[PDB]
């Protein structure tokens, strides 16, 4: 792919809208719209990436490449077939990416798109939202069971916390929906403070599954949250906490 564009502005804000949801526009400018629709089950996924030519002029040598770090490539298997290199004016084309999670991962793939448009050369780079929580599935459990598991994860490096300013209104119902969207079960009457949220789930990867517990604590007067994750793996607590911290 030769010289690669630096990540488009808005790439990171956009990437964050795709963590608890599967459907959306990932990138759009005056020439091109990139849309996604995905679904996951256990350690697998299927993503549809749609490329729309918003102009009256054909794109030639239209070349989407997915670019992964050397470690990412060992943790995540992406399979696709490239699009035809010519995209007509007004057309939307697509590709299907078949995804297999081999083990826990923290980096995101980059989608790089290059093409000719008239006499110009176009180069777009954006982060692809394939994230560890996409392999996160809910675990329902009573309070007693929760606290047993919580107390088993008492090593310092198993726990990660973050304190942050709410980006959105601290809307109870929407907060519950994003926790669910993230892949967690929402467990009621575990924290005796009814303002607090508690979650459990399991990450499903080809080689190992990791049990995860979470607690979110809003302070509506201060407009701030504390999120605590405990998992058996420091990298998994880290990643899920960073991800989940950007949702509220």
């Amino acid at each position: 792919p030769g010289i690669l564009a630096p990540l488009a502005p808005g790439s990171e804000d956009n990437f964050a809208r795709f963590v608890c949801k599967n459907n959306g526009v990932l990138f759009e400018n005056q020439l091109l719209q990139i849309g996604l629709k995905s679904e996951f089950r256990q350690n697998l996924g299927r993503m549809f990436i749609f490329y729309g030519n918003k102009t009256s002029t054909q794109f030639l040598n239209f070349t989407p490449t997915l670019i992964c770090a050397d470690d990412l490539q060992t943790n995540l298997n992406l399979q696709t077939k490239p699009v035809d290199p010519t995209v007509d004016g007004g057309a939307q084309v697509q590709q299907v990416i078949n995804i297999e999670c081999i083990s826990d991962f923290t980096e995101a793939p980059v989608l790089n798109i290059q093409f000719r448009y008239g006499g110009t050369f176009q180069n777009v780079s954006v982060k692809l939202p394939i994230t560890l929580n996409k392999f996160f599935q809910p675990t329902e459990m009573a309070s007693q069971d929760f606290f047993q598991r919580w107390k088993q994860l008492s090593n310092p490096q198993q726990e990660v916390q973050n304190i942050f300013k709410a980006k959105h209104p601290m809307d109870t119902e929407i907060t519950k929906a994003k926790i669910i969207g993230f892949g967690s079960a929402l467990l009621e009457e575990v924290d005796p403070n009814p303002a607090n949220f508690v979650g459990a789930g399991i990450i499903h990867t080809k080689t190992t599954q990791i049990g995860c517990l979470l607690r979110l604590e809003p302070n509506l007067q201060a407009q701030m949250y504390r999120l605590t994750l405990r998992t058996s793996k420091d990298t998994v607590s880290q990643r899920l906490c960073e991800l989940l911290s950007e949702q509220f």
Partner: peptide, 8 residues
């Protein structure tokens, strides 16, 4: 373009 998949 109205023939496109949309992402609402």
């Amino acid at each position: 373009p109205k023939g496109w998949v949309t992402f609402e």
